[PDB]
A and B are shown apart, each in its own frame.
Chain A
Amino acid sequence: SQPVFASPLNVEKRRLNEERALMQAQKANIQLPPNYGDMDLILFPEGSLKNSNNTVIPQSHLKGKSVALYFADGADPKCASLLPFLLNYYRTMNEGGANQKIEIIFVSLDRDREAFESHRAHMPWLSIDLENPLTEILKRHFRVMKEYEVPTYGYGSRTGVPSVIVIGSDGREAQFLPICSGLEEGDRALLRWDWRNTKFA
């Protein structure tokens, strides 16, 4: 239940993990319901991520990297301002090193496929397509809304787009980079991104 309980992703987590606990109990002094640390999920299925020029890349290639979800629109002027800076951070951080360390996974608020592709051509990191429900349940998970149009479960707007969320393996928000947040310091929050502690185990 991190950073929130009432996400579709955490609902799926709880159902899968606890029904596994139930069938384990039926097969066998085991806790019902299971502990949140003991809950394990697959954040991205096999067909979710896709790199440049459209070849499938799975979750297990993200091991040993600080991965951040880029929640972005195409026609948004903050997004247009922020895209080249996250480009230079990506380029310099992945050139200054003998090992790749940072990764970025885009999910989109473009209106349609043509806007999705026109935005996508300017981003070299990993991306998630617009039709699969992952690109929506991730936003419902990480509390990012364009406006008040989702059925919301007493949430507040954690951020408006653009955002980058450094994530963990079990969906836990490792850290927030505050571009449009409580600090409101834009296009310099990328420097607060650490890569020592926030690994994708």
Chain B
Amino acid sequence: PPTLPFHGESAYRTDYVPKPLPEVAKPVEVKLPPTLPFNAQSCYRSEY
């Protein structure tokens, strides 16, 4: 009599295949608002 072949693969080795890594290199760039000039002056030095 012939010998039947052995097909079979457990659930772990069917769907817990090593998966591709998620692509990540995403820093968050922040822009510093430029400082305003100090246009303010005192009373004594303004009038006297």
With A156-B8, A156-B9, A157-B9 in contact, do A182 and B17 touch (Cβ < 8 Å)?
no
With A2-B20, A172-B20 in contact, do A148 and B14 touch (Cβ < 8 Å)?
no
Alpha-carbon separation in the docked complex, A3 to B9 (Å): 15
Are B20 and A182 in touch, CB under 8 angstroms?
no
Number of interface residues of B (CB under 8 A): 10
Are A156 and B20 in touch, CB under 8 angstroms?
no
Interface flags, B1-26, vs A, CB<8A=1, else 0 = 00001011101011101001000000
Count A-B contacts at CB 8 Å.
Answer: 19
Alpha-carbon separation in the docked complex, A155 to B8 (Å): 8
Cβ-defined partner of B5 (8 Å) among A2, A3, A148? A148
Cβ-defined partner of B17 (8 Å) among A3, A148, A155, A157? A3
With A148-B5, A148-B7, A172-B20 in contact, do A156 and B15 touch (Cβ < 8 Å)?
no
Contacts of B11 in A (CB 8 A): 182
Alpha-carbon separation in the docked complex, A148 to B8 (Å): 11
Alpha-carbon separation in the docked complex, A157 to B11 (Å): 12
List the A residue with the shortest CB-CB distance to B6. Answer: A148
Interface flags, A151-176, vs B, CB<8A=1, else 0 = 00001111000000000000010000
Alpha-carbon separation in the docked complex, A172 to B7 (Å): 23
Contacts of A155 in B (CB 8 A): 9
The residues of B with any CB-CB pair to A shorter than 8 Å are: 5, 7-9, 11, 13-15, 17, 20
CB<8 Å pairs between A and B, sample of 14:
A2-B20, A3-B17, A147-B5, A148-B5, A155-B9, A156-B8, A156-B9, A156-B13, A158-B9, A158-B14, A172-B20, A182-B11, A182-B14, A182-B15
